[PDB]
Amino acid sequence: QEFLAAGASFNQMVTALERMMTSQQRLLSDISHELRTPLTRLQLGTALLRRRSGESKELERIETEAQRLDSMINDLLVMSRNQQKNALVSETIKANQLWSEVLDNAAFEAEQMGKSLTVNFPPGPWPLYGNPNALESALENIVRNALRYSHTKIEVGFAVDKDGITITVDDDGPGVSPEDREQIFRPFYRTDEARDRESGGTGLGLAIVETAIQQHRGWVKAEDSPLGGLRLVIWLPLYK
Amino acid sequence: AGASFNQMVTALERMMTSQQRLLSDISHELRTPLTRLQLGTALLRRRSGESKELERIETEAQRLDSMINDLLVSETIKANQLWSEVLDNAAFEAEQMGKSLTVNFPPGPWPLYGNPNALESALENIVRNALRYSHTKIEVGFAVDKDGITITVDDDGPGVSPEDREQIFRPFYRTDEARDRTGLGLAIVETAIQQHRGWVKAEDSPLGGLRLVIWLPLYK
Numbered sequence: 206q207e208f209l210a211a212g213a214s215f216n217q218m219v220t221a222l223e224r225m226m227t228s229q230q231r232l233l234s235d236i237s238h239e240l241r242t243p244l245t246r247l248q249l250g251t252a253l254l255r256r257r258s259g260e261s262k263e264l265e266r267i268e269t270e271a272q273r274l275d276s277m278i279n280d281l282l283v284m285s286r287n288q289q290k291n292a293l294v295s296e297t298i299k300a301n302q303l304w305s306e307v308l309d310n311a312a313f314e315a316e317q318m319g320k321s322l323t324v325n326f327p328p329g330p331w332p333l334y335g336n337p338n339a340l341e342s343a344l345e346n347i348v349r350n351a352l353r354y355s356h357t358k359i360e361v362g363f364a365v366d367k368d369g370i371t372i373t374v375d376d377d378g379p380g381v382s383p384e385d386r387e388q389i390f391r392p393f394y395r396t397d398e399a400r401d402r403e404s405g406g407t408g409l410g411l412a413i414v415e416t417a418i419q420q421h422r423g424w425v426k427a428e429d430s431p432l433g434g435l436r437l438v439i440w441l442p443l444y445k
Numbered sequence: 446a447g448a449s450f451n452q453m454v455t456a457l458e459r460m461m462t463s464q465q466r467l468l469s470d471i472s473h474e475l476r477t478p479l480t481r482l483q484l485g486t487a488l489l490r491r492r493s494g495e496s497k498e499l500e501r502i503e504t505e506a507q508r509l510d511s512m513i514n515d516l517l518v519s520e521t522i523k524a525n526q527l528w529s530e531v532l533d534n535a536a537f538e539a540e541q542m543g544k545s546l547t548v549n550f551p552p553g554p555w556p557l558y559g560n561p562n563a564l565e566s567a568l569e570n571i572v573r574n575a576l577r578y579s580h581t582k583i584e585v586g587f588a589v590d591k592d593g594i595t596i597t598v599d600d601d602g603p604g605v606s607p608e609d610r611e612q613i614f615r616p617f618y619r620t621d622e623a624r625d626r627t628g629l630g631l632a633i634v635e636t637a638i639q640q641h642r643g644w645v646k647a648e649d650s651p652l653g654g655l656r657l658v659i660w661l662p663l664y665k
């Protein structure tokens with residue numbers, strides 16, 4: 206329930222939260238899997254139709270939309286594989302252990318593109334409670350996005366407080382129109398500029414991030430970056 | 446620690462409702478391209494009239510419509526109502542693949558009690574796997590008894606090594622043989638059948654390929 210809360214300790218509560226999420230995830234991967242077959246048949250139907258009556262504006266529309274669904278579903282299952290490839294068990298972890306590998310790899314990666322990665326303040330031994338892999342992925346996705354869309358530089362900044370950790374990621378690349386700053390976290394949502402880019406697919410990254418982070422009782426925000434591009438702010442509570 | 450009771454409450458609400466919100470958002474996003482897909486068939490039916498193919502497209506679109514709708518949110522059934530569409534569609538698909546599908550004995554009006562969709566997917570996955578891995582032929586056979594229904598599926602394709610016959614039902618697992626040419630199919634099957642107090646098994650097939658046997662209990 207998580208409403209296991211009538212009586213229970215915080216830890217027990219989250220395990221009940223972990224129990225629910227896994228079934229929600231089983232549901233999503235089972236439906237994702239099962240959507241593929243009628244879809245397969247539909248495509249055999251269009252194919253057979255194109256053979257009998259040839260190309261059409263209408264048929265072309267049906268075929269491209271069927272391909273959109275096909276693609277989304279494929280990406281949904283790729284995701285499902287990864288989130289269940291993660292065991293979920295929530296544990297106490299120090300911020301530095303949790304994200305140092307991620308940041309070091311990002312420095313290596315930034316260096317290859319010829320770009321620069323700068324850590325304004327590194328993470329310390331600050332206590333968190335959660336799924337280590339999930340929070341790691343949250344940060345690699347935010348920084349990999351930054352490395353990709355940046356023009357020359359990336360910046361990462363940690364901040365600690367009696368209350369929590371605040372992670373800030375910045376890039377000097379193109380921004381995100383103010384309207385889209387709310388929308389970028391919706392699933393399958395990409396900006397017209399990344400659709401013009403025409404590279405990559407999926408718009409799950411930030412949807413996965415927002416979900417994980419809310420599940421970890423924190424929050425995420427997209428803003429104008431002082432470097433001129435995009436700013437991502439993660440806040441997570443301390444565990445005591 | 447510093448937080449207001451209100452901040453606690455919102456943190457808590459958002460925390461429990463995030464996956465729900467995620468799934469309902471995924472559902473919304475799949476629904477819009479689908480809505481367009483349905484007007485393409487509609488506009489096409491306007492332009493070029495009825496066709497078997499157009500009918501096919503339309504019903505498949507109505508199925509997608511229903512399952513995406515599930516993302517947002519046991520009964521008594523007769524085996525024949527439960528699985529005939531699964532089988533008819535398996536026949537449609539088989540004809541296109543250039544393969545042959547044979548039903549040695551069809552299901553009758555045999556009482557079952559469970560989730561119709563779960564059991565449908567259970568059978569559909571077993572025969573559709575058989576259409577995939579088969580070389581030329583597939584055979585489906587029903588059997589009834591005072592106790593239950595036993596569905597047997599056979600193919601003439603490559604088999605599965607005896608060691609792997611237990612593993613293939615594990616989720617996200619595929620044999621190394623299949624890895625040269627998702628792995629939820631037989632996991633979905635095992636789950637639904639076990640949930641209906643039945644069982645699933647992989648064996649040697651008389652056709653030379655793989656044999657899958659589903660047993661489900663009858664209803665009182």
Ligand SMILES: Nc1ncnc2c1ncn2[C@@H]1O[C@H](COP(=O)(O)OP(=O)(O)OP(=O)(O)O)[C@@H](O)[C@H]1O
Nearest residue numbers: 350351354380389395396399407408409410411435
């Ligand atoms: N650093 C960035 N600068 C500008 N826009 C960005 C940046 N990162 C993301 N966006 C915009 O927000 C969208 C959401 O991206 P998100 O990570 O959710 O999916 P994605 O990066 O497109 O694909 P993937 O799922 O493979 O990461 C992106 O397509 C892009 O349009």
Ligand SMILES: Nc1ncnc2c1ncn2[C@@H]1O[C@H](COP(=O)(O)OP(=O)(O)OP(=O)(O)O)[C@@H](O)[C@H]1O
Nearest residue numbers: 574575578613619620623627628629630631632655
């Ligand atoms: N009829 C068959 N003949 C031979 N091998 C099979 C047969 N059915 C399943 N297998 C093997 O067992 C594995 C389990 O398949 P399962 O249905 O669980 O996933 P899948 O069919 O590979 O993928 P999907 O989930 O998309 O159907 C397959 O990858 C395949 O190696």
